[PDB]
Structures are given as structure tokens and as C-alpha cells.
A paper describes a structure:
Finally, using a structural biology approach, we solve the structure of a SHIP2 catalytic domain in complex with a bound dimeric ligand and potent inhibitor. The related compound, 5,5′-ethane-1,2-diylbis(oxy)bis(benzene-1,2,4-trisphosphate)20 (5) (hereafter named 1,2,4-dimer), is a bridged dimer of the surrogate ligand of IP3Rs, benzene 1,2,4-trisphosphate. The crystal structure of the 1,2,4-dimer-SHIP2cd complex comprises two monomers of SHIP2 and a single copy of the inhibitor in the asymmetric unit. The 1,2,4-dimer does not occupy the positions of the crystallographically resolved ligands or of the predicted bound states of docked ligands in catalytic domain or multidomain structures. Indeed, the 1,2,4-dimer ligand fails to directly contact the L4 loop. Remarkably, we observe that phosphate P4 of 1,2,4-dimer interacts with D613. This, we suggest, precludes interaction of this residue with R682 and adoption of the L4-out conformation that, in its transient motions, accompanies optimal catalysis. While the distal binding of 1,2,4-dimer does not significantly modify the L4 closed (L4-in) conformation from that seen in the complex with BiPh(2,3′,4,5′,6)P5 (1), the compound is a potent displacer of 2-FAM-InsP5 and a potent inhibitor of 5-phosphatase activity against Ins(1,3,4,5)P4. Thus, 1,2,4-dimer meets both the kinetic and structural criteria of an uncompetitive allosteric inhibitor of SHIP2. One intriguing possibility is that a previously unrecognized substrate or product is evident in the 1,2,4-dimer (5)-liganded structure.
Src homology 2 domain-containing inositol phosphate phosphatase 2 (SHIP2) is one of the 10 human inositol phosphate 5-phosphatases. One of its physiological functions is dephosphorylation of phosphatidylinositol 3,4,5-trisphosphate, PtdIns(3,4,5)P3. It is therefore a therapeutic target for pathophysiologies dependent on PtdIns(3,4,5)P3 and PtdIns(3,4)P2. Therapeutic interventions are limited by the dearth of crystallographic data describing ligand/inhibitor binding.
Residue numbers in the entry: 423 to 533, 540 to 584, 599 to 674, 684 to 698, 702 to 728
């Protein structure tokens, strides 16, 4: 058993705040990490960002530096692939570099919007992580599905994790969306999330799992706070994490609410994998 943290954050083309620990520790809204397990530094940290204005060299240092402050360890980068403002990085608890083997990165571009990928071996178990940024727009669902198909075809596993700004929107007008959000009734909204719909229609992410979403749409917020959406773009769960395990436990899945540099909130996910 190992702990694989996964984070996806569309940073709205603006640098991050110097402290994003609530992202690392799965603190905020949704299925957050309990008061005890948060103190257990995870074995692998995967950081997927879109519209990331920071440079590859420095962004990795911000990540590796932030991890040391939290864990008191010097996590070891395994791979880091970037495609314009789309960047992904993988770090590992230093006491497990010998376990890693056959590290591989890849990329695919559609349009910037695309997908960066990383895969490696941990003991006799292989992993794959895909950080994407699909076509935006309320009425471009077929485009997003086709973007997913290209990535699934143009990329170069025992456990496969697909995350990023999938950009799927809600099929409901703003009046009812805000009404349901104010009551924290997300199920009526989730029933009309395009990603759920496209999965339930067996059109994309076939046999992919996603943890129950119990946090509010991560988009689109006004920069500076979380108590308000900038819907003039209906709120939507643009930023998602799905997995497909060979014939996995999800100890958390949510978003922060104290990181307010972007119009997206950071989304996190932690898993215990074999």
C-alpha cells in the first residue's frame, strides 16, 4: 500500500500564492482528509496545472520546496513534462527512489489546450498520469470527447489516473445552478454535468471511476474569494480526477477554498494503491 496524491489546478494564467499547503493536505470542501491521515506524508505527489504562468524550472522548485516545508523531506522529482502553460510534475518520498523504474513522459496538443503525460514503475506495479486541458465552452462537449480520444490515441497500466481541466460544464441555467448551490444540493447538478452524462452514455472514459463529488463547482470564481462565482459562464465542475485500475481506495477528493489567485479552485485527490 502507498499513498498517491493527485492535484489539478487551472491557475488562471496567474502565479500562485506562496503557500498552497491546503492543496497538498486535501483540506477544504468535499471528501477532505481527516485530522489524522493528513499528517501522513504521501508517497507520490502528482501536480497537474493548466494555464500555469510559472516557468518549468521555478515551478518545480516551488513544488519541491513547499513539500519540504510541510513534510520536512526533500521529495525527489521523477518526471516533469510541460506543453506551454500546461505542466505536470511527479515527486516521490525520498525513501523510495529505488522503487521507481522506467520513467516516461509524453504530450499531445489540440489547438493552449492539450495533455501532458507521465508513467513509471513502482516495484512491479506500473502507473500512468495524464494532465489535460480540453476544449472549453458550454456547447463543445463533442469536442472535449474527441480531444479525449486523440489523447487516448496519441499518448505514449495497472493504475491509470486522468485529471486536469476537463472543461465539462453543467446542463442547467444559472438561476437553478445558484439555487442548488446555495442549498448545497449538488446531486441535481451532477445529474446534468456533461462529464457524467458522457460517461453514462458510454461515450468517453469507459470503465473509469470518479469519487463522489461533494464539493461545489470549482469554476468560475472571482479572484480573491470563494464566496462568489463570476457567472457573466455558469459554474461548473471543470477540474476532475478519474482513475481506471487493473481488475484502489480514494481517501479524499475535493477542492480548496483558501487559494484564490485563480478563477478555478485547486482540486485534490488521494488514493491508496497497490
Amino acid at each position: 500500500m502507498i499513498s498517491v496524491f493527485i492535484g489539478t489546478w487551472n491557475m488562471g494564467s496567474v502565479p500562485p500564492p506562496k503557500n498552497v499547503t491546503s492543496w497538498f493536505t486535501s483540506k477544504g470542501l468535499g471528501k477532505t482528509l481527516d485530522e489524522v491521515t493528513v499528517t501522513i506524508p504521501h508517497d507520490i505527489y502528482v501536480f497537474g496545472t493548466q494555464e500555469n504562468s510559472v516557468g518549468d524550472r521555478e515551478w518545480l522548485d516551488l513544488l519541491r520546496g513547499g513539500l519540504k516545508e510541510l513534510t520536512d523531506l526533500d521529495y525527489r522529482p521523477i518526471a516533469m513534462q510541460s506543453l506551454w502553460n500546461i505542466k505536470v510534475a511527479v515527486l516521490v518520498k525520498p525513501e523510495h527512489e529505488n522503487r521507481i523504474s522506467h520513467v516516461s513522459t509524453s504530450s499531445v496538443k489540440t489547438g493552449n489546450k492539450g495533455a501532458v503525460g507521465v508513467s513509471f514503475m513502482f516495484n512491479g506495479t506500473s502507473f500512468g498520469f495524464v494532465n489535460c486541458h480540453l476544449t472549453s465552452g458550454n456547447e463543445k462537449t463533442a469536442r472535449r470527447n474527441q480531444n479525449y480520444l486523440d489523447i487516448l490515441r496519441l499518448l505514449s497500466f495497472t493504475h491509470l489516473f486522468w485529471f486536469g481541466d476537463l472543461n465539462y460544464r453543467l446542463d442547467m441555467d444559472i438561476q437553478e445552478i445558484l439555487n442548488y448551490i446555495s442549498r448545497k444540493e449538488f446531486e441535481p447538478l451532477l445529474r446534468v454535468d456533461q462529464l457524467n452524462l458522457e460517461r453514462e452514455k458510454h461515450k468517453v472514459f469507459l470503465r473509469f471511476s470518479e469519487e463522489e463529488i461533494s464539493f461545489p463547482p470549482t469554476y468560475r470564481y472571482e479572484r480573491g474569494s470563494r464566496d462568489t462565482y463570476a457567472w457573466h459562464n455558469v459554474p461548473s465542475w471543470c477540474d476532475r480526477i478519474l482513475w481506471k485500475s487493473y481488475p484502489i481506495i480514494c481517501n479524499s477528493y475535493g477542492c480548496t477554498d483558501d487559494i484564490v489567485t485563480s478563477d478555478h479552485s485547486p482540486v485534490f485527490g488521494t488514493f491508496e494503491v497497490g
